[PDB]
Design a protein around this ligand. Structure first.
Ligand SMILES: Nc1nc2c(ncn2[C@@H]2O[C@H](COP(=O)(O)OP(=O)(O)O)[C@@H](O)[C@H]2O)c(=O)[nH]1
Ligand SMILES: [Mg+2]
Length: 164
């Protein structure tokens, strides 16, 4: 048998949420300005602690109350994403954490700074990001979906945290 885990990936527009889901589940990254997923989630079968696990990664479309409720319904873990090159996306992180708690509760959550390959154009100081993760008591990953750096670790950690 297998354990199914619904995970939500949230954050401001263009931080790389759709790309992150496509990378993890399909192993691909294209150079398009915006990535789209035409179904509610992509999935990947993995092994965690000698258990078959079906991860279902739900991608946001962009919300009205019923849309928000359907997206978060039954969510079991959360990736909170901001972008190295988008200051507003970083400043919104605390509000995203509050929003996920409001919509589903205090589910296992990880903080991800995506686009770390664009470090020369970074709008975030390393110390600021570290302080935010410490204040929110969240594990923090610096990630590049484009270069496949610290993507797999995000989902493995959340799956382990959910099962443990
Ligand atoms: N340089 C770089 N671009 C990225 C990375 N991840 C995503 N992008 C690009 O950021 C843009 C927005 O990505 P998308 O997945 O549509 O973001 P979403 O709106 O959060 O779903 C696209 O051009 C992606 O290819 C990354 O790690 N590095
Ligand atoms: Mg998207």
């Amino acid at each position: 048998s297998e354990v199914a885990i619904k995970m939500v990936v949230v954050g401001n527009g263009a931080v790389g949420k759709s790309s992150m889901i496509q990378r993890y589940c399909k192993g691909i990254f294209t150079k398009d300005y915006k990535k789209t997923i035409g179904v509610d989630f992509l999935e990947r079968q993995i092994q965690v602690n000698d258990e078959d696990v079906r991860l279902m990664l739900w991608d946001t479309a962009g919300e009205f109350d019923a849309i928000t409720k359907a997206y978060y319904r039954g969510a079991q873990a959360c990736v909170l994403v901001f972008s190295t090159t988008d200051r507003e996306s970083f400043e919104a992180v605390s509000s995203w954490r509050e929003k996920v708690v409001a919509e589903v509760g205090d589910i296992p959550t990880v903080l991800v700074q995506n686009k770390i390959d664009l470090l020369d154009d970074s709008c975030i100081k390393n110390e600021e990001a570290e302080a935010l993760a410490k204040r929110l008591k969240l594990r923090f990953y610096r990630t590049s979906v484009k270069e496949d750096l610290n993507v797999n670790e995000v989902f493995k950690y959340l799956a382990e945290k959910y099962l443990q």
